[PDB]
Structure 1
Amino acid sequence: PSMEDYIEQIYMLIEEKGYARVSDIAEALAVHPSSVTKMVQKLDKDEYLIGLVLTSKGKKIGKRLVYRHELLEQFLRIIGVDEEKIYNDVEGIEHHLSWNSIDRIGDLVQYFEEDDARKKDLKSIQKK
């Protein structure tokens, strides 16, 4: 329920529907609409947003958070984590990693994405 969680979901709802309803934010984050209203005011005072609209500041952060999430899902998928486990692991770790780690994981994903033989060799290890 951090500021980052809220901005992440808000950004996504705007990308999905064109707007972010309080009730949609509430559902997405499994919190009561009261909590949502509280966070909105803080987000507004810290100028992440102004229905509700993200400032360029909020947009940059939202875009980054969605990037981080997708990257980390891709990372765990590539290394062979059971698909069903991936979402909860990503949600758990995404806010705790330094940009340095995100970027190195980014490079690692790129490393596997550029020659399928590498993915096959990784798979071979798991077999042992």
Structure 2
Amino acid sequence: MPTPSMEDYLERIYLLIEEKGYARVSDIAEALEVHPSSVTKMVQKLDKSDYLVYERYRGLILTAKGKKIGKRLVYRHDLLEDFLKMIGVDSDHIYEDVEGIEHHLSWDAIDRIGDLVQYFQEDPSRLNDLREVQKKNE
């Protein structure tokens, strides 16, 4: 039920607390280069749905459900980037490819990509076999 942008907010809030222990509306407005009123509008939508609370002095605080979602999105990002690096996407394209597909994949496809990323590591000579296919095509 959360929109993609709502997920992006919860992940960004989780990562602000990872960075300095607190998440501020001004932090998000500055990182996004948007007006703080659009951040407070999004925060209100996340509050109303019990993904976070706000207290004056402590700032934005994730609920159990909000923190569950934020962490999952960090992991999905890490997983998709592992995948694209494994198959050889160059450093010019990999960041926007990860951002591009992370909200347009079913969790089924995310899980299947996870199995793929695990497969190339359980016997890492699989990765060298893959690199050789790419070399042969050049």
TM-score when normalising by structure 2 = 0.87
How far 1:109 sits from its partner (Å)?
Answer: 0.3
1:47 lines up with 2:55 in the alignment: no
Output the CA distance in 2 between the equivalents of 1:28 and 1:90. 19
Output the CA distance in 2 between the equivalents of 1:18 and 1:48. 18
**Residue in structure 1 matching 2:87, options 73, 79, 86:** 79
Partner residue of 1:101?
A: 109
How far 1:16 sits from its partner (Å)?
Answer: 1.5
> Unaligned 5+ residue runs, structure 1?
none
3-state SS of paired residue (1:53):
strand
> Unaligned 5+ residue runs, structure 2?
54-58
Partner residue of 1:66?
A: 74
Is 1:9–1:28's contact at 8 Å kept on the other side of the alignment?
A: no
Is 1:11–1:59's contact at 8 Å kept on the other side of the alignment?
A: yes
Output the CA distance in 1 between the equivalents of 2:121 and 2:63. 34
**Residue in structure 2 matching 1:32, options 30, 35, 49:** 35
How far 1:27 sits from its partner (Å)?
Answer: 3.2
1:19 lines up with 2:27 in the alignment: no
Please identify which structure carries the higher helix content.
1
Amino acid at match of 1:36: V
How far 1:30 sits from its partner (Å)?
Answer: 4.0
Output the CA distance in 2 between the equivalents of 1:3 and 1:78. 29
Amino acid at match of 2:42: M
TM-score when normalising by structure 1 = 0.93
Give the number of equivalent residue pairs: 128
Q: Structure 1 runs of 4+ off > 4 angstroms?
A: none
Amino acid at match of 1:117: S
1:91 lines up with 2:94 in the alignment: no
